[PDB]
From Swiss-Prot, chain A:
Taxonomic lineage from the root: Eukaryota, Fungi, Dikarya, Ascomycota, Saccharomycotina
Tagged with keyword Ion transport: no
Protein name: Translation initiation factor eIF2B subunit alpha
Quaternary structure and partners: Component of the translation initiation factor 2B (eIF2B) complex which is a heterodecamer of two sets of five different subunits: alpha, beta, gamma, delta and epsilon. Subunits alpha, beta and delta comprise a regulatory subcomplex and subunits epsilon and gamma comprise a catalytic subcomplex. Within the complex, the hexameric regulatory complex resides at the center, with the two heterodimeric catalytic subcomplexes bound on opposite sides.
Gene knockout outcome: Inhibits GCN4 derepression in glucose, amino acid, or purine-starved cells.
Family: Belongs to the eIF-2B alpha/beta/delta subunits family.
Record's keyword terms, sorted: Acetylation, Activator, Cytoplasm, Initiation factor, Phosphoprotein, Protein biosynthesis, Repressor, Translation regulation
The encoding gene: GCN3
Subcellular localization, as worded in the UniProt entry: Cytoplasm, Cytosol
From Swiss-Prot, chain B:
Biological role stated in the UniProt entry: Acts as a component of the translation initiation factor 2B (eIF2B) complex, which catalyzes the exchange of GDP for GTP on the eukaryotic initiation factor 2 (eIF2) complex gamma subunit. Its guanine nucleotide exchange factor activity is repressed when bound to eIF2 complex phosphorylated on the alpha subunit, thereby limiting the amount of methionyl-initiator methionine tRNA available to the ribosome and consequently global translation is repressed.
Keywords assigned: Acetylation, Cytoplasm, Initiation factor, Phosphoprotein, Protein biosynthesis, Repressor, Translation regulation
Gene this chain is encoded by: GCD2
Other known facts: Present with 10300 molecules/cell in log phase SD medium.
Protein name: Translation initiation factor eIF2B subunit delta
Subunit structure as annotated in this protein's UniProt entry: Component of the translation initiation factor 2B (eIF2B) complex which is a heterodecamer of two sets of five different subunits: alpha, beta, gamma, delta and epsilon. Subunits alpha, beta and delta comprise a regulatory subcomplex and subunits epsilon and gamma comprise a catalytic subcomplex. Within the complex, the hexameric regulatory complex resides at the center, with the two heterodimeric catalytic subcomplexes bound on opposite sides.
Source organism (scientific name): Saccharomyces cerevisiae (strain ATCC 204508 / S288c) (Baker's yeast)
Residues of the whole record sequence present: 237 to 593 of 651
From Swiss-Prot, chain C:
Residues of the full protein shown: 24 to 472 of 712
Species in which this protein is naturally found: Saccharomyces cerevisiae (strain ATCC 204508 / S288c)
Molecular functions per Gene Ontology: guanyl-nucleotide exchange factor activity; translation initiation factor activity; translation initiation factor binding
Function, in words: Acts as a catalytic component of the translation initiation factor 2B (eIF2B) complex, which catalyzes the exchange of GDP for GTP on eukaryotic initiation factor 2 (eIF2) and is regulated by phosphorylated eIF2. Its guanine nucleotide exchange factor activity is repressed when bound to eIF2 complex phosphorylated on the alpha subunit, thereby limiting the amount of methionyl-initiator methionine tRNA available to the ribosome and consequently global translation is repressed.
Protein name: Translation initiation factor eIF2B subunit epsilon
Assembly notes: Component of the translation initiation factor 2B (eIF2B) complex which is a heterodecamer of two sets of five different subunits: alpha, beta, gamma, delta and epsilon. Subunits alpha, beta and delta comprise a regulatory subcomplex and subunits epsilon and gamma comprise a catalytic subcomplex. Within the complex, the hexameric regulatory complex resides at the center, with the two heterodimeric catalytic subcomplexes bound on opposite sides.
Transmembrane segments: none
From Swiss-Prot, chain D:
Lineage: Eukaryota, Fungi, Dikarya, Ascomycota, Saccharomycotina
Pfam families: IF-2B
Gene Ontology biological-process annotations: cytoplasmic translational initiation; regulation of translational initiation; translational initiation
Function: Acts as a component of the translation initiation factor 2B (eIF2B) complex, which catalyzes the exchange of GDP for GTP on the eukaryotic initiation factor 2 (eIF2) complex gamma subunit. Its guanine nucleotide exchange factor activity is repressed when bound to eIF2 complex phosphorylated on the alpha subunit, thereby limiting the amount of methionyl-initiator methionine tRNA available to the ribosome and consequently global translation is repressed.
Name used for this protein in its record: Translation initiation factor eIF2B subunit beta
Subunit structure: Component of the translation initiation factor 2B (eIF2B) complex which is a heterodecamer of two sets of five different subunits: alpha, beta, gamma, delta and epsilon. Subunits alpha, beta and delta comprise a regulatory subcomplex and subunits epsilon and gamma comprise a catalytic subcomplex. Within the complex, the hexameric regulatory complex resides at the center, with the two heterodimeric catalytic subcomplexes bound on opposite sides.
Other remarks in the entry: Present with 6650 molecules/cell in log phase SD medium.
Domain of life: Eukaryota
One GO cellular component term: eukaryotic translation initiation factor 2B complex
């Protein structure tokens, strides 16, 4: 039946439902076919499937986070000690239900937690997340004199795409280079971030250039923020300042080649420390200070 | 009855709060004391190996032994002067060498146990089950936790390693030994020592007893040491309400150096060691000891030379003082390895109310 | 105290180096890619020399040439060199006799056996010798001994167990044993001729040979008198103890710091390692002694001369030294081994704890472990060696060979297998 | 260039070399004195006729000295100073021989465009001047020094190895109305004994001494006020070589704590060449002094160094016999004592 | 200003063997009288008084050991709103010179609302107690605020009846007595 196939199914469209939610839905669909009453035929198979998915990954992180969350939910479910049928039914219901919830969470984020750009506080943004864009688009109907600043995105010109999404709302924008990132920290108020995950350490698992940005923010004391829908607390620890579960090579010193070939293995993923989140915007209340870690503890009861 | 007064050397000026004095050589005491406690105290006072991890274990063992030996009186019940005895023991311990956080925890546990089975029972049935229970507890919250920590560490290492080390952390010794033997990686170990007590030397000896590739140095000799080399590890004693690293001596400077030179640090911890006593400095309450920890002239421990220095009470206006327990900077050490695998020390008391 | 003459026992322990010491003199061979004589000379200078005398015999012309080339040759030196040239092969008794015949012996005359290089400041020693001499009329000569590596284990040729004094620092007993090597005579003896006079008897073995002696005007005369003493350690000291010339005192200097002489091959290696490390207090090559040298110090106990080149990406373990004019290729794994002057490494080579002398080729894809390669002797492609495989002069290890542990190889162009001409013995080729 | 010319004309070269190599020569001051004496000997004896050739000879000699020993900077410096002294006089002479404009004392633009006398006595006098300078640094410092530190403040003291530093401290301590508490770090495998001596001296001087284990710096830093380096040599971009061990870490700590770092030295200690490396300059001690044993100690490859280098950044002021300078400024002081072509021999 | 902070100080001062000297900033607009009162109270008990101008903190901070506040409102990410005048700059100075910052706190005084902008929570002050006469006010523009907000980047402990807690942690404390539902009422 496959989760991989389901994942493939959505690509051209998307741009609405959270990825981690689609994956969860797929998992649920996979489950509700082969009898979810028994725990011997099922949980192990689910785990195997997850492993397979992990193996098959090109360059995607949050899947694991999603699946572990799902597992946790499942575990939580069968503590009521009543019967096998009702609980199973509830579990089955809770896949589509979870997907439905994501939209509500997004709504909550974009109507309560959008008071971080109000007094024309110019926004230096990097990391394309849906939530960040959703909040920005929802704040365009209030006309609170907002202004956008874009540091260029170069995995393969996502920057262009981003600038094309801000042209539908009609708002003055500007191209920024991440070498002249020391140059302009002046008129721009704060630095806001989209990402790929939040760590057990606290810091952010992100993209093509982030640690430098963080450093600069620290230097300037103009606060550094991360904005997302909350379900990216993967069981991972970046213990070093140049280590994570990485898809590509970590700085591959290529051999003495000839005609401009092996070069562009430029780090498309980077991370900065725990003493960098001035605030983190999440749908489970606006909570940050040691919140992720607390949540993890609550989950694993340790 | 006991002995007080007659203390060695000048009392200086600052850091004047904690017990540092005393019975080093024994002369008359109270007459019903079991001598194993006294022996232990004598050991701890003149110890050059112990470092947070084993002390508590030793104490537990001693208590077990006491319980095994314990005879309930023909008159009064199983806990009448027992409490008094325990208090006396505690007093003796404090006089010898201060009760650590782990020791406090142990005491608390003992008290709890005392409350659990109140006076009504005979002898060989109650203590039979008590001793077993306590053994089980020891097996649970300690050894297994240590094992878990070890296995966490095992994965934490990826490909190619060059490390710098400090401290008589039994766990760290185990870790490094494990790396060397049953993981067969490319594990390089550089050792840092300290003057107050020789832990680094012990570590080096242990490494040798495996046949490890070992560089060896000290607190000052570091500026050249980084001229490839990545990992740094420490061994903390206890963490308070604050999340601050309230541990032994030479850590903080090293940590700072590491921070400055680009690649971070990782420390290891146990899920019982946390406290509700609150402090943010070295001065509040510290392991303070006799200046005899600074008399020897380099190289080894037993040499004794009549070179340049060898007096204290006759030295008019001279204040020779040293500290044993420190309070390291909060944001500096990144990773901490407790029972729940991995986490930021911003947790502080996340397991304290969890109990 | 001043004006002291130097006599050095050279051309002595030939063929103790069993494959080598055959075509050129014993002391002329390069230690740390530079001659052994020079270190000794420097030591002598430090001690306080006023004239140089050497016993050259096993090939003398070459020695003479070296002297001519040397730095003590020109007027500037506080000590000129004039080598002693006698008939071939005579023991230390006969050499002493020869010396006496010539007769340039004065007061506190100095004799050093073999070649030695150590750190300990000699002035103090000299002073002590003088003061002790001033005590009684019949004082003789000085011994050097240092405290050892806690327990003895790498010592079988010369593990002399010294019964010693603290009140006078005087030898009681000398005995040599095979003990750790050949378990035939697990044995100890005490002779009672000096029992009821000393009282403070100290039983020890853990002390190291140095063979360095300040000798009074008594010694050559004594040698002439008793012609039975062909040796100087086993027969002489014992004789002195047994009151051959009645009522005579000796010295046994005891130092807390390093002092060892030159003896075997593993011992040589150890000495070299010590020199490379920071063992004997200030002794270095980076300071540059012979002037033509251009050595410089580097991090993690690494030596590099000027003209030294090593290519990129070669992960080194610990402690490496390279001589000038060297070209090393790529992808090599090296741990605790010296590669000499103007040597050439190809590519992809694994090394651990080895020794490589003057102008040697380490051929493409080869492994060297704890073994030695001498001057002009070359390793070709694919040679797998093991612990302590000694390679002599001009040994051409050509293409494809496998030499097992401790396989010694000849030097002169005899008794031992593997020879000078093409391929070392697995398929027979040679004279 | 060898010692082929310098034989029965000048002898003491060899002696100098010996003193350098085996370390019978001790302390930068003494080395400087030795060098001065050498120069005197050169001057009283050598035969000239020309001037450029003499200069070349001197350069060669300097080079040879450098090749014999690098860690002795004072030796080099004094030579350079004397060369500079000679050079100015030579320049003056040339102007009279031939028989000029510049905005300030020296020029960049004078290097682009095309540009028998009694110089020997002037050269002699230069040496004397140098000697005099060497004689007293402290008697030109304690006027810019007993100014910085105040009542109820706290000093932190690494490197009690430079004889100047101690003297500076004691001059400050002299005053009957000024009070300060002194923390002293040890420095283990190269400085312990010296530190102990310093402590003893402080005790003698009737002042509040505090003995510190090299570990325990962090448990006291809250109260810390000042930082003093016991440097041996000073260089181009400001920075210093120091008289061994236990200075770098403490400096770093101070920087982190932003607690002021002062440098006390001298301009004979001042050198006219860049420390492009620490490796080529700073030397290492003896692995024997840390641990006993030998055969298990082929395995115990231990690392320990004498001298210490500190980057220009942590240190802020260099109070001299001339006065207070800065790491940004000290270069010009060097130039004021050694000339532009004398940098490279 | 408060009766709590004063009492805390008094309790410490009772153990007069514990040595501590008090520097007190006057607090320009409103705190002045209150500061004076506090000083008087200190004097009453026999506590050593030092009266401070607000411009002069940079000149004192390097000699200052420990700093205690007596705030009005406690917040989410760690910061506080204190009872008027001269706290932001002080905190900045402390951060620069690295100084320990105590704060007397209460959980009922603690608020679970998150402060996100300076543009709202900071409360401004009256020009009435600056300069008499209103004809110079035609051209110039007097700027003044009463109560000020602190970023958490600076303060380190909150000494409560429960205990001293970390600012990047106090949210948990609040939640141990408050909710996420009772926020936007």
């Amino acid at each position: 039946f496959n989760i991989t196939e389901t994942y493939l199914r959505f690509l051209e469209e998307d741009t609405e439902m959270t990825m981690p939610i689609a994956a969860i839905e797929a998992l649920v669909t996979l489950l509700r076919i082969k009898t979810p009453e028994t725990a011997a035929e099922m949980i192990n198979t689910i785990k195997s499937s997850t492993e397979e998915l992990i193996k098959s990954i090109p360059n995607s992180v949050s899947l694991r986070a999603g699946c572990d969350i799902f597992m946790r939910f499942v575990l939580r479910n069968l503590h009521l000690y009543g019967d096998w049928e009702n609980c199973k039914q509830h579990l089955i219901e809770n896949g589509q239900l979870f997907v439905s919830r994501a939209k509500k969470s997004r709504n909550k984020i974009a109507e309560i937690g959008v008071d971080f750009i109000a007094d024309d506080d110019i926004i230096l943004v990097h990391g394309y997340s849906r939530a960040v864009f959703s909040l920005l688009n929802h704040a365009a109907n209030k006309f609170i004199r907002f202004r956008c600043v874009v540091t260029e995105s170069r995995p393969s010109k996502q920057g262009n795409q981003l600038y094309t999404l801000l042209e539908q709302k009609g708002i003055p924008v500007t191209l920024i280079v991440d070498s002249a990132v020391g140059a302009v920290i002046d008129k721009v108020d704060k630095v806001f971030v989209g990402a790929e995950g939040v760590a057990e350490s606290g810091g952010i698992i992100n993209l093509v250039g982030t640690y430098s940005v963080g450093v600069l923010a620290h230097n300037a004391r103009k606060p550094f923020y991360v904005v997302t829908e909350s379900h990216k607390f993967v069981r991972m620890f970046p213990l070093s300042s140049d280590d994570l579960p990485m898809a590509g090579p970590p700085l591959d010193f290529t051999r003495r080649t000839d005609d401009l070939e092996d070069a562009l293995r430029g780090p498309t993923i980077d991370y900065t420390a725990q003493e960098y989140i001035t605030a983190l915007i999440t749908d489970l209340g606006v909570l940050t200070p040691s919140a992720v870690s607390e949540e993890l503890i609550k989950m694993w009861y340790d | 009855p006991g002995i007080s007064s007659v203390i060695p050397t000048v009392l200086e000026q600052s850091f004047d709060n904690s017990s540092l004095i005393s019975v080093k050589e024994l002369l008359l005491n109270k007459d019903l004391i079991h001598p194993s406690i006294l022996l232990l105290t004598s050991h701890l006072a003149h110890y050059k190996i112990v470092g947070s991890i084993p002390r508590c274990i030793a104490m537990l063992e001693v208590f077990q032994i006491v319980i095994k030996d314990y005879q309930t009186p023909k008159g009064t019940t199983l806990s009448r002067n027992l409490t008094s005895y325990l208090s006396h023991q505690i007093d003796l311990l404090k006089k010898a060498r201060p009760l650590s956080v782990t020791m406090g925890n142990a005491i608390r546990w003992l008290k709890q146990e005392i409350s659990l089975i109140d006076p009504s029972t005979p002898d060989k049935a109650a203590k039979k089950d008590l001793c077993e229970k306590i053994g089980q507890f020891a097996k649970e919250k300690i050894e297994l936790a240590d094992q878990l920590i070890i296995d966490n560490a095992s994965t934490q290492i990826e490909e190619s390693t060059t490390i710098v080390t400090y401290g008589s952390s039994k766990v760290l010794t185990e870790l490094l030994l494990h790396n060397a033997i049953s993981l067969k990686k490319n594990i390089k170990v550089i050792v840092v020592d300290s003057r107050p007590l020789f832990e680094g030397r012990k570590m080096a000896e242990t490494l040798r007893n495996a046949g490890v590739n070992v560089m060896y140095a000290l607190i000052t000799s570091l500026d050249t040491i980084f001229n490839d080399v990545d990992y740094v590890f420490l061994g903390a004693h206890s963490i308070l309400s604050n999340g601050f690293l309230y541990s032994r001596a030479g850590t903080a400077m090293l940590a700072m150096s590491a921070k400055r030179r680009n690649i971070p640090v990782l420390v290891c911890c146990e899920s019982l060691k946390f406290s509700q006593r609150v402090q943010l400095d070295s001065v509040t309450f510290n392991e303070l000891a006799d200046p005899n920890d600074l008399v020897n002239i380099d190289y080894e421990n037993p040499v004794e030379r009549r070179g340049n220095k060898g007096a204290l009470l006759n030295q008019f206006i001279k204040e020779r003082k040293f500290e044993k327990k420190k309070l390291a900077m909060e944001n500096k050490p990144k990773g901490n390895k407790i029972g729940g695998k991995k986490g930021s020390e911003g947790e502080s008391k996340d397991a304290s109310n969890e109990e | 105290e001043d004006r002291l003459q130097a006599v050095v026992l050279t051309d002595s322990y030939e063929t103790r180096f069993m494959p080598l010491t055959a075509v050129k003199p014993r002391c002329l061979l390069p230690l740390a890619n530079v001659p052994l004589i020079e270190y000794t000379l420097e030591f002598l200078a430090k001690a306080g020399v006023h004239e140089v005398f050497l016993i050259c015999s096993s090939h003398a012309n070459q020695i003479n040439d070296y002297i001519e080339n040397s730095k003590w040759n020109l007027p500037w030196s506080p000590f000129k060199i004039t080598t002693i040239m006698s008939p071939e092969a005579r023991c230390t008794g006969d050499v002493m006799r020869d010396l006496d015949n010539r007769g340039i012996i004065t007061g506190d005359f100095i004799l050093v056996s073999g070649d030695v290089l150590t750190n300990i400041d000699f002035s103090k020693m000299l002073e002590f010798h003088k003061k002790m001499h001033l005590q009684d009329k019949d004082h003789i000569s000085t011994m050097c001994l240092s405290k050892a590596s806690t327990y003895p284990k790498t010592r079988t040729i010369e593990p002399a167990a010294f019964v010693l004094d603290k009140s006078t620092s005087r030898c009681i007993y000398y005995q040599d044993l095979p003990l750790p090597s050949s378990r035939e005579k697990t044995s100890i003896q005490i002779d009672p001729e000096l029992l009821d006079n000393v009282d403070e008897f100290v039983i020890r073995n853990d002390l190291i040979d140095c063979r360095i002696d300040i000798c009074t005007s008594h010694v050559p005369l004594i040698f002439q008198e008793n012609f039975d003493y062909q040796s100087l350690r086993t027969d002489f000291v014992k004789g002195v103890i047994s009151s051959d010339i009645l009522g005579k005192h000796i010295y046994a200097y005891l130092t807390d710091e390093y002092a060892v002489r030159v003896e075997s091959w593993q011992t040589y290696d150890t000495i070299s390692q010590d020199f490379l490390g920071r063992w004997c207090y200030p002794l270095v090559l980076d300071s540059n002694i012979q002037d033509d040298q251009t050595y410089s110090y580097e991090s993690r106990h690494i030596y590099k001369e000027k003209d030294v080149v090593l290519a990129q990406s070669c992960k080194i373990g610990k402690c490496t030294a390279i001589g000038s004019g060297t070209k090393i290729g790529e992808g090599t794994k090296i741990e605790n081994s010296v590669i000499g002057r103007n040597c050439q490494i190809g590519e992809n080579i694994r090394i651990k704890n080895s020794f490589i002398w003057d102008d040697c080729i380490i051929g493409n894809n080869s492994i060297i472990d704890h073994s030695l390669i001498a001057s002009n002797a070359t390793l070709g492609s694919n040679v797998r060696l093991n612990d302590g495989c000694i390679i002599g002069f001009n040994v051409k290890i050509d293409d494809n060979m496998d030499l097992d542990r401790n396989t010694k190889i000849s030097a002169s162009p005899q008794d031992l297998d593997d020879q000078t001409l093409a391929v070392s013995i697995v398929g027979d080729k040679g004279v | 260039h060898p010692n082929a010319a310098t034989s029965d004309v000048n002898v003491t070269i060899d002696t100098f070399v010996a003193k350098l190599k085996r370390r019978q020569v001790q302390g930068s001051y003494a080395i400087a004195l030795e060098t001065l004496q050498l120069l005197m000997r050169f001057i009283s004896a050598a035969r000239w006729n020309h001037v450029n050739d003499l200069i070349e000879q001197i350069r060669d000699l300097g080079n040879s000295l450098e090749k014999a020993h690098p860690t002795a900077f004072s030796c080099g410096n004094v030579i350079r100073r004397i060369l500079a002294v000679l050079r100015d006089e030579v320049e003056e002479d040339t102007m009279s021989t031939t028989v000029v404009a510049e905005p300030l004392i020296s020029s960049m633009f004078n290097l682009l465009q095309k540009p028998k006398t009694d110089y020997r006595q002037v050269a002699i006098q230069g040496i004397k001047d140098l000697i005099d300078e060497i004689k007293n640094i402290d008697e030109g410092i304690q006027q810019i020094a007993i100014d910085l530190i105040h009542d109820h403040e706290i000093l932190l003291t690494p490197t009690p190895d430079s004889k100047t530093v101690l003297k500076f401290l004691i001059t400050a301590r002299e005053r009957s109305n000024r009070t300060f508490t002194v923390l002293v770090t040890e420095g283990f495998p190269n400085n312990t004994k010296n530190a102990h001596e310093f402590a003893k001296k402080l005790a003698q001087h009737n002042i509040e001494t505090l003995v510190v284990p090299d570990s325990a710096v962090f448990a006291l830093m809250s109260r810390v006020g000042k930082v003093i380096i016991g440097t041996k040599a000073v260089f181009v971009n400001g920075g210093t070589i120091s008289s061994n061990s236990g200075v770098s870490s403490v400096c770093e700590c101070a920087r982190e704590f932003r607690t002021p770092v002062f440098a006390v030295a001298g301009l004979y200690k001042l050198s006219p060449l860049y420390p492009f490396d620490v490796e080529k300059f700073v030397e290492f001690g003896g692995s024997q002094r840390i641990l006993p044993r030998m055969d298990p100690r082929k395995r115990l490859d231990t690392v320990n160094q004498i001298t210490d280098y500190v980057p220009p950044e942590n240190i802020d002021i260099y109070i001299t016999n001339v006065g207070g300078f800065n790491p940004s400024f000290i270069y010009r002081i060097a130039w004021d004592n050694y000339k532009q072509i004398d940098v490279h021999l």
